Amino acid sequence: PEYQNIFTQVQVQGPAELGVDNENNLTEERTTGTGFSQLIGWIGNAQLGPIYLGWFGIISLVTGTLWFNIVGFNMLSQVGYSIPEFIRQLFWLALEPPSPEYGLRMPPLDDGGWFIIASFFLLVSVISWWLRSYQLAEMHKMGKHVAWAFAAAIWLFLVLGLFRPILMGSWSEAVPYGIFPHLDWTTAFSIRYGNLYYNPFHALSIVFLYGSVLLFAMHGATILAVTRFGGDRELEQIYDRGTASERAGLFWRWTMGFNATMEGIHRWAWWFAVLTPITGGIGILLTGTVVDNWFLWAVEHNFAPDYTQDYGYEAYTTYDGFLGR
Amino acid sequence: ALLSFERKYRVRGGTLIGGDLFDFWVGPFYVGFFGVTTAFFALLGTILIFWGASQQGTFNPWLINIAPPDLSYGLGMAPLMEGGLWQIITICAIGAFVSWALREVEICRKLGMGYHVPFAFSVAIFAYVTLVVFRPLLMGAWGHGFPYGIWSHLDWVSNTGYAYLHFHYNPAHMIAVTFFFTTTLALALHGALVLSAANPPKGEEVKGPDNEDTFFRDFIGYSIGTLGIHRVGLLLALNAGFWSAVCIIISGPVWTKGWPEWWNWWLEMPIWPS
Amino acid sequence: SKFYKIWLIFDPRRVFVAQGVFLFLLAAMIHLVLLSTEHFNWFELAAANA
Amino acid sequence: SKFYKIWLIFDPRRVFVAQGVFLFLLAAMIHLVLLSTEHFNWFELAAANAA
Amino acid sequence: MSKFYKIWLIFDPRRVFVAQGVFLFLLAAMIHLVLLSTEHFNWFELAAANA
Amino acid sequence: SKFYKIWLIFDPRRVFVAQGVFLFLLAAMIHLVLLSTEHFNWFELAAANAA
Amino acid sequence: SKFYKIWLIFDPRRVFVAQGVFLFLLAAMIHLVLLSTEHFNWFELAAANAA
Amino acid sequence: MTCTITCWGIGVLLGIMTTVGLMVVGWSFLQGAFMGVLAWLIVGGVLAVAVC
Amino acid sequence: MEETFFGNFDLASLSLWLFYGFFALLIYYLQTENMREGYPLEDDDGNTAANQGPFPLPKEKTFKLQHGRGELTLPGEDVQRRDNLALRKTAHGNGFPMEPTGDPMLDGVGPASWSKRRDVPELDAHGHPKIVPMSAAEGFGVSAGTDPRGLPVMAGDGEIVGLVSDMWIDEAEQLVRYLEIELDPEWGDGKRLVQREMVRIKSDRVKVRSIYGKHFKNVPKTKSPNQVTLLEEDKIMAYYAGGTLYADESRLEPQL
Amino acid sequence: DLSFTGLTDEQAQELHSVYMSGLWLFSAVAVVAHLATFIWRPWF
Amino acid sequence: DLSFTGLTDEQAQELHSVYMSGLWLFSAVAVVAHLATFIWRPWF
Amino acid sequence: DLSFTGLTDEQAQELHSVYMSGLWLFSAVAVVAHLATFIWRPWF
Amino acid sequence: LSFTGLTDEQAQELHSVYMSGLWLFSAVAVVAHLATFIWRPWF
Amino acid sequence: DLSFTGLTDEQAQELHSVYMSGLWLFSAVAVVAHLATFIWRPWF
Ligand code: BCL
Ligand code: BCL
Ligand SMILES: CC[C@H]1c2cc3[nH]c4c(c3C)C(=O)[C@H](C(=O)OC)c4c3nc(cc4[nH]c(cc(n2)[C@@H]1C)c(C(C)=O)c4C)[C@@H](C)[C@@H]3CCC(=O)OC/C=C(\C)CCC[C@H](C)CCC[C@H](C)CCCC(C)C
Ligand SMILES: CC[C@H]1c2cc3[nH]c4c(c3C)C(=O)[C@H](C(=O)OC)c4c3nc(cc4[nH]c(cc(n2)[C@@H]1C)c(C(C)=O)c4C)[C@@H](C)[C@@H]3CCC(=O)OC/C=C(\C)CCC[C@H](C)CCC[C@H](C)CCCC(C)C
Ligand SMILES: COC1=C(OC)C(=O)C(C/C=C(/C)CC/C=C(\C)CC/C=C(/C)CC/C=C(\C)CC/C=C(/C)CC/C=C(\C)CC/C=C(\C)CC/C=C(\C)CC/C=C(\C)CCC=C(C)C)=C(C)C1=O
Ligand SMILES: COC(C)(C)C(=O)/C=C/C(C)=C/C=C/C(C)=C/C=C/C(C)=C/C=C/C=C(C)/C=C/C=C(\C)CC/C=C(\C)CCC=C(C)C
Ligand SMILES: COC(C)(C)C(=O)/C=C/C(C)=C/C=C/C(C)=C/C=C/C(C)=C/C=C/C=C(C)/C=C/C=C(\C)CC/C=C(\C)CCC=C(C)C
Ligand SMILES: COC(C)(C)C(=O)/C=C/C(C)=C/C=C/C(C)=C/C=C/C(C)=C/C=C/C=C(C)/C=C/C=C(\C)CC/C=C(\C)CCC=C(C)C
Ligand SMILES: COC(C)(C)C(=O)/C=C/C(C)=C/C=C/C(C)=C/C=C/C(C)=C/C=C/C=C(C)/C=C/C=C(\C)CC/C=C(\C)CCC=C(C)C
Ligand SMILES: COC(C)(C)C(=O)/C=C/C(C)=C/C=C/C(C)=C/C=C/C(C)=C/C=C\C=C(C)\C=C\C=C(/C)CC/C=C(\C)CCC=C(C)C
Ligand SMILES: [Fe+3]
């Protein structure tokens, strides 16, 4: 069959590319060591590039490790420093938020006090990383779209653990730091406040989350479909469009009646991705604070479906019939 | 109408089963043999939905609910107002979706471009197919498909999700979700990269691929490249669609018990010193 | 003694930025630890006294 | 006496924006922990004063 | 024995000192947290115990 | 003997960091194992000894 | 008697790294499985002996 | 490739063998599969690095 | 907060409608930003179409092109339009496909159609040409996969036309962009380029299924053997994909 | 002659002198504010 | 003689003296703050 | 002779003397810290 | 003949000290197992 | 002779001589620590 551009059939490696650099002079804080990996080269660039050791990045890395360690040692102290039990219960242990009977006041260390300390360091690391993205775009004389797209993720991140607990009157509304526990919190949050399916902003965020995956399957396949026309070089197609941009546009113009440009595709791509946590952040922020039961909110706003059938298994079958006896 | 460059690409040929009989454009849309069947199936399915809405008693888009038959009906056809209409719309939906994918094959064949998009859509079709015709057959009843309602099919997901006792512990759902979050994460970063390079601060030259390539090298220490991101992104989205198909096809006909109890293999191993 | 040579090894710009952030985070952290305990929570003691 | 040399190695523009943001956040953050404390919550205390 | 000064001929002072500084503080924080966890060595709580 | 020839193969600046992280990780792991056992948990023994 | 020429095909630095990892992993694995059984668990035997 | 693909194929065959090998001596399919998957990652990666 | 104003319209409803207004503005902004290329609309006769859609064209935005390539304003006067297209309509109306007057692949009208890009090579950050033969590359070499250099080239119909002489690499991003084909005297003359995304490399031979043996002699050439301009780059890539529909009638005619 | 930020010695001397005047002004208001609130409701 | 940063020995000597003056001042107020807290509510 | 970091023997001896002086001073504080901590509720 | 760029002159020397290390590693392992066998025999 | 990282034969001999002294010193403290903790709570 025709060669699908999923895996490169041959890859070349030359001298390592350090960077472009300018009078902003990013070289001093840039690492001098790079590596090459052929396994990752079958699908992308094979060069493991050099970190830029900025102060926002270093602070984020140091404080992020502090949050990671604090949660880790509390987890290790959960099972009494038993490593085999710690590994076995790794997906189950967590650093639980403070008990609800403490409010915004600082709770004792064993009852969420270490959660606040870990959360504070996590907040510093996450914000510092965002400042790194903003500074890196500024030093590269590029757009701040990476920083703004990241800031959208910060919005839901801040709402989940900082903004909502502050104006909910208790630190207990924060998300536990656990693999399964934050899944338990995710389910319990929906159950406590009705049903987040019936939260319009949760539904809106789901619309953009499906759309984000939908677009990036559309965009990923369309570019790979026009990669025979140099469609992977999107930036040069923006400045001087070739048959790759035209065919990609006409594929979707002939399919769904309208298309995008090689640059306008990423504006569509950016916004649904950015809108996914923005809408979710709004929905969580006003969940409980404003609406304490989403299904009842749906009932009074007339978008909760009504079912006229019976709700019992005895109305459709019988216990003996189900067992086959 | 036509774009400023569309005239040349509008050439005859590149059809699968149709010929010059259906080889024409209606507005911007391209009609083919499968565009004829898409138009028939989509209109028939859409009209039957509103016909069912009329008999349901409400035309509210939120409250419209066409539901599959009872589980007592098994795999056989049900009365139209008792679930049979849902089966026909499902048949129309499968025909509309398959024809749409086959039409996209005709679009890309005429343009000389690859068949990546119809293949990528087929993965999303497979996710719908496994939800409405594959899972019901493995259970022996058409009543396990989701109802055709804006909010009714949200109740089905909620009920099916809790029908397996905290669906969050489903290992395939765990894999499927992290593909959904990564795809949106990848979409945001990739969309930001191109826009940032193409739209610098005022008075600054536009940035080429080298400037955007080194940004993540200075950001996360590795950049997958202009070509790499599109293929990894397509696989990230296709895996999300594929693993979503897996997480629901293994729910009923594979693991009838609760999903946390699936993790009992990890909790109960000989290596662990109980 | 003669620890002044540390500036021949450490960049004055780098060490002070790290020191400034490190001291504040170690000043906010400890303050929260006393705020955690009921014995050293000066806010609660004022309420208890009054 | 000789602390003025701190500006020879710190950029005044970079420090001041960090100083201004840090000063307000610290001022705000301290104001919230007073509100959380029932003894120092001057808002709910006025209601208590009014009896 | 006394030739330990040659460790600097292999390790540059800048990178080892930065690694040493982070390691010592993390070690100090790790140990302090451990005592804070134990009820016997939690100096904060036993202060409350003494009236 | 003649074990000094290992440095003709191993890079001193890459194996010193290798054992440096290994020795501490080994030391930390064994200390954690001792803390897991109630017999050798010197922190809990101090609490038990005080009674 | 003529096993010296194994290194004619095996790179020393390439096999020494693998051997060092293998020996420690094997030693830890044997120690771990030895701690799994209650007869050879020297930590529990010490606890039982002093009881 | 070639060598790397073959080395991966040896690992998945070994992973399948370990999946059923532990099932014979007890365990369960899911417990055996994890060891089989773990074996495939370890020996498959080691063979793809050392042999090739 | 917990109390409702004018009915059941609470703060959650107010936020929902505020987003609805913002989204409508966003869709207008997003849709307009995609109208910078290919607009205004036209009909099959080339005249301006009576209908331009519900979205007006946006304000002119400017791109400060690098390496001293001037500025660029997208909305208006697309310089990439091709003037003499070898096509004529199969119908007097609109919405019907065009039939090429002459050779579709030579004229480049259908899938073989290219775009009138700049006649200059694409430049990296250094200002050097972006795509260069690996012979001119400083320290580049094959790191993994099958090296196609020296492998015979097999066309779509199975004919052997020549062996690969070199691969045109992208030193800026470190990947292969082309393969140089040294045509045998029977099947043509000189060297021609085939993009890597259209070529399939096997263990012993390298094959392209899009173009038959007789069409390699007509593959567009490059003015210089050391660099390829965007115009030649677009012509070369389009020609191979044009053969997916024009190599023989069987590809153009329906498959069922 | 150790200007890491490209700012000469004389400029730094006046920069700090003005900055301290702002710092003392900020601290003086804070001291009065702290003194006022301690009389209102002491925390010690 | 060795200076990775580049600043001379004399420059290091004066910078350390200023740093120590700041460090002792920071420590001295910390000790007084630590001392005054001990009379308030001792932790030993 | 065997300078992996461009640092001569004389610098190494000078720098190690400072490092050991700092090390012993840091260890001396830790010893007094541990000795006082052992007097007040020992762990043995 | 050779795959790692070594000759018989030094490859023999390399194995000579490797066996010395192997014997020393085994010797301390033999006494370690002998001590464990006396303490907690497993046969 | 063999040199995969440089370090002519003389250089490696002195590197191991001080490495062995460091290893023995580290193990000597470990032996003393192990002897001390065995007297405290023996594990045999
Ligand atoms: C029973 C479970 C409840 C449920 C409860 C919730 C809750 C609770 C929430 C959601 C939210 C979301 N739900 Mg829901 N949801 C349910 C059912 C669903 C279903 C479905 C098919 O059934 C779907 C598709 C969704 C979909 C979604 C997404 C639309 C949305 C989160 C987007 C997101 O990623 O934000 C992106 C942001 C984040 C994930 C955090 C950003 C992380 C930060 C920025 C990164 C820090 C990194 C960290 C430091 C680690 C770094 C380590 C690195 C390795 C170095 N839900 C049911 C109703 N849902 C969210 C929402 O409401 O949005 C409005 C949310 O809070
Ligand atoms: C109580 C509920 C349980 C739960 C139970 C379920 C159940 C039950 C299901 C999922 C499924 C999914 N869950 Mg879950 N899930 C939960 C919590 C979550 C959370 C979260 C943050 O909490 C998230 C992110 C997810 C995420 C997801 C995705 C993995 C997946 C969504 C379907 C999908 O992939 O597309 C798949 C669907 C398609 C691609 C549709 C195909 C569309 C067709 C081809 C085109 C449509 C055309 C149409 C006609 C429109 C045209 C009209 C106009 C002309 C344009 N779940 C909660 C805890 N989850 C669903 C799934 O996997 O489905 C496979 C599933 O059935
Ligand atoms: C637009 C919404 C989407 C989005 C976007 C988004 N996320 C982003 C960005 C953007 C645009 C970034 O630029 C930023 C980034 O850099 O990505 C690569 C990021 C990011 N979002 C991330 C995660 C993430 N995104 C998510 C989702 C989303 N973010 C949405 C789908 C999710 C969810 C909800 O599942 C997660 C979990 C990160 C990959 C990154 C943020 C990381 C960052 O910059 O700071 C965070 C903290 C650290 C880097 C420090 C961590 C600590 C250590 C590195 C870990 C431990 C190391 C080791 C074990 C130490 C051991 C020590 C001991 C031995 C002593
Ligand atoms: C499948 C993998 C991922 C993906 C990919 C993907 N989707 C795609 C494509 C690709 C690559 C296309 O090329 C194709 C397209 O052209 O999009 C614009 C498409 C598409 N996927 C779409 C939607 C969509 N994708 C989704 C998700 C995803 N997209 C996945 C994550 C979702 C989810 C899960 O929310 C939805 C809703 C469409 C925009 C489009 C398919 C267009 C189509 O099929 O047109 C023909 C049909 C009609 C015009 C109407 C048919 C009506 C029926 C006959 C009756 C109703 C049936 C239906 C089941 C009722 C539903 C009732 C309620 C549940 C609402
Ligand atoms: C860089 O590269 C790229 C581009 O840029 C070159 C691109 O752009 C894109 C495309 C992506 C974009 C973001 C561009 C903008 C697009 C979107 C925002 C949409 C994608 C995102 C979503 C979240 C999905 C939203 C879905 C939408 C907008 C709906 C579109 C889909 C539909 C199914 C509806 C349209 C289809 C219709 C109306 C039916 C099709 C018509 C036919 C088959 C014709 C049949 C006719 C007959 C048989 C004859 C009968 C005639 C009749 C009855 C007359 C009636 C006439 C009519 C016209 C109906 C990509 C991926 C890309 O990578
Ligand atoms: C679980 O953990 C719990 C128990 C909670 C816990 O608490 C853990 C606590 C732990 C681990 C304590 C760890 C703390 C340690 C180790 C203390 C480090 C702190 C130190 C060392 C204090 C430095 C102060 C230096 C200053 C502040 C100098 C002032 C500098 C001045 C401003 C001069 C600046 C220079 C100039 C003005 C001119 C120079 C320039 C030219 C000449 C050009
Ligand atoms: C679960 O685990 C539990 C049980 C909890 C646990 O506790 C585990 C604990 C475990 C395993 C202990 C691990 C700790 C170890 C091993 C201790 C290492 C610590 C050491 C060794 C201390 C060095 C201190 C040296 C300094 C700090 C010198 C200061 C140097 C000064 C600042 C001078 C520097 C200046 C110059 C050199 C300038 C000269 C420059 C020129 C001449 C240019
Ligand atoms: C699951 O099952 C249960 C029952 C639980 C189980 O336990 C299964 C157990 C199983 C399967 C046993 C598997 C163990 C095996 C097979 C034992 C391999 C172990 C061996 C063989 C030991 C080598 C030691 C050699 C050294 C360590 C030399 C030291 C070398 C020194 C350091 C010198 C190096 C220096 C040079 C050479 C310099 C030369 C240089 C020049 C000449 C320049
Ligand atoms: C899970 O199982 C359970 C039962 C729980 C378990 O615990 C399993 C335990 C297991 C398996 C034990 C595994 C332990 C092993 C294998 C012990 C390795 C430890 C070793 C080998 C000790 C090296 C010491 C090295 C130093 C410390 C040197 C000091 C060097 C000094 C500082 C000098 C450095 C400087 C120079 C050389 C200068 C030269 C430079 C020039 C000449 C320029
Ligand atoms: C060998 O390893 C050792 C060493 C053992 C080790 O460590 C290993 C570590 C191990 C295993 C830990 C692994 C961690 C795991 C699995 C946790 C996953 C984490 C998850 C799922 C996070 C979900 C919730 C996130 C939110 C949503 C936060 C919200 C944060 C908010 C925004 C912070 C806001 C700030 C505050 C509340 C502070 C306010 C106070 C002041 C401002 C003063
Ligand atoms: Fe793209």
Method: cryo-EM
Among K2, K9, K13, the strongest candidate for a mutation testing the L interface, having the largest count of L CBs within 10 A, is K2
- CB proximity under 8 Å: D 1-51 to C: 6, 9-10, 22, 33-34, 37-40
What A127-134 contacts at long range (C-beta under 8 Å, 24+ apart), as own/partner pairs, is A127/A154, A128/A56, A128/A57, A128/A59, A128/A60, A128/A63, A129/A56, A129/A57, A129/A60, A129/A64, A130/A154, A131/A56, A132/A54, A132/A56, A132/A57, A132/A60, A132/B219, A133/B219
State how far the Cα of A247 lies from the Cα of I238, in Å rounded to an integer. Answer: 11
Q: Is B144 annotated in some ligand binding site?
A: no
Q: Which residues contact J28 (CB under 8 A, 6 or more apart)?
A: none
Q: Kindly state the DSSP code that residue I182 receives in the 8-state scheme.
A: E
Verify whether ligand 1 is closer than 6 Å to residue A284 (CB atom): yes
Which of chain K's residues have a Cβ under 8 Å away from the Cβ of J1? 11
Place of tokens 């045998």: I184
Binding residue per annotation — C42? yes
Tokens of I10: 């609470």
Q: What is the resolution of this structure in A?
A: 2.7
- Count of other CB atoms within 10 angstroms of residue H20: 12
Distance F33 CA to ligand 10 centre (A): 25
Nearest CA among J24, J29, A120, A122 for reference residue D33: A120
| 3-class SS of residue F19 | helix
In angstroms, the CA A147 to CA A137 distance is 8
Helix then strand count (H, E) for chain J reads 1, 0
Nearest to I149 by CA among I201, I105, I101: I201
Q: Hey, are the CB atoms on K43 and E43 less than 8 Å from each other?
A: yes
Q: Kindly report the backbone phi and psi dihedral angles of residue I178, in degrees, each rounded to the nearest multiple of 5, phi listed first.
A: -145, 165
Which residues of M are annotated binding-site positions for bacteriochlorophyll a? 33, 42
Cite the annotated binding site of M by residue number: 15, 33, 42
Collect all residues of chain M within an 8 Å Cβ-Cβ radius of residue N44.
Answer: 39
A305 touches B149 (CB < 8 A) = yes
Biggest alpha carbon–alpha carbon distance for chain D? 58
Give which of A89, A277, A99 is closest to A176, Cα–Cα: A99
C29 CA: nearest ligand 6 atom:
5
Distance between the two ends of chain E, CA-based, in angstroms?
A: 52
Dist CA B52 CA B68 (whole Å): 12
Would residue I91 be called left, alpha or beta, if left means φ above 0 and alpha means ψ between -120 and 50 degrees?
beta
In single-letter form, the type of residue at position K17 comes to S
Q: In this complex, which of E11, E35, E40 lies closest to F50 when CB atoms are compared?
A: E40
Rounded to the nearest 10 degrees, the angle between the axes of helix B84-111 and helix I230-246 is: 120
Classify residue A160 by its DSSP letter: I
Beta bridge pairs of residue B148: B66
* Separation CA I238–CA I219 (nearest Å): 10
Backbone angles phi, psi at A12, to 5 degrees: -110, 150
Element spanning N1, H or E: none
Nearest to I214 by CA among I246, I237, I241, I256: I246
Whether the CB-CB separation of L26 and E18 falls below 8 Å is answered with: no
Residue F31 Cβ inside 6 Å of ligand 7? The answer reads yes
Distance, CA of L44 to CA of I165 (rounded, Å): 79
Query: Residues J25, J30, J31, J37: is their CA dihedral positive or negative?
Result: positive
Contact yes or no for A81 and F29 at CB 8 A: no
b or e along B209-240 (b: 16 or more beta carbons within 10 Å of the residue's beta carbon)?
Answer: bbbbbbbbbbbeebbbbbbbbbbbbbbbbbbb
φ, ψ for residue A32 (rounded to 5)? -100, 0
Q: Strand, helix or coil at B148?
A: strand
Q: Do I147 and A10 touch (CB under 8 A)?
A: yes
- In Å, what is the CA distance from J18 to each residue of A118, I215, J7, J13? 39, 80, 16, 9
Alpha-carbon gap, residue B190 to F13, rounded angstroms: 39
Q: Sort out which chain L residues have CB atoms less than 8 A from K2's CB and list them.
A: 7, 11, 15
Whether A64 contacts A122, CB under 8 Å: yes
Burial class, D37, CB count within 10 angstroms (exposed 0-12 / middle 13-18 / buried 19+): buried
What is the b/e burial string over M2-41, where b = at least 16 CB atoms within 10 angstroms of the residue's CB? eeeebeeeebebbbeebeeeeeeeeeeeeeeeeeeeeeee
E43 is in an annotated binding site: yes
**What are the distances in angstroms from CA K33 to CA A57, I58, K37, K38, K39?**
33, 64, 6, 9, 10
Q: Strands I206-207 and I200-201, how do they pair?
A: antiparallel
The dihedrals phi and psi of I192, each to the nearest 5 degrees, come to -135, 155
Å from N12 to nearest chain E CA? 13
Which of helix, strand or coil describes residue I185? coil
How many Å is the Cα radius of gyration of chain E? Answer: 19
Alpha helices in E1-51 (DSSP H): 13-37, 43-49
Q: What is the DSSP letter of A159?
A: I
| Cβ pair I238, I114 in contact under 8 A | yes
> What does R_g of chain A's alpha carbons equal in angstroms?
25
Backbone CA torsion sign across I64, I66, I68, I72: negative
From B173, B181, B255, mutation site for ligand 2 pocket: most ligand atoms within 8 A of C-beta: B173
What is the phi/psi pair of residue F18, to 5°?
Answer: -65, -50
Measured from the Cβ of residue I48, the count of other Cβ atoms closer than 10 Å reads: 10
Instruction: Give me the torsion for CA of I12, I15, I17, I21, rounded to 10°.
Output: -170
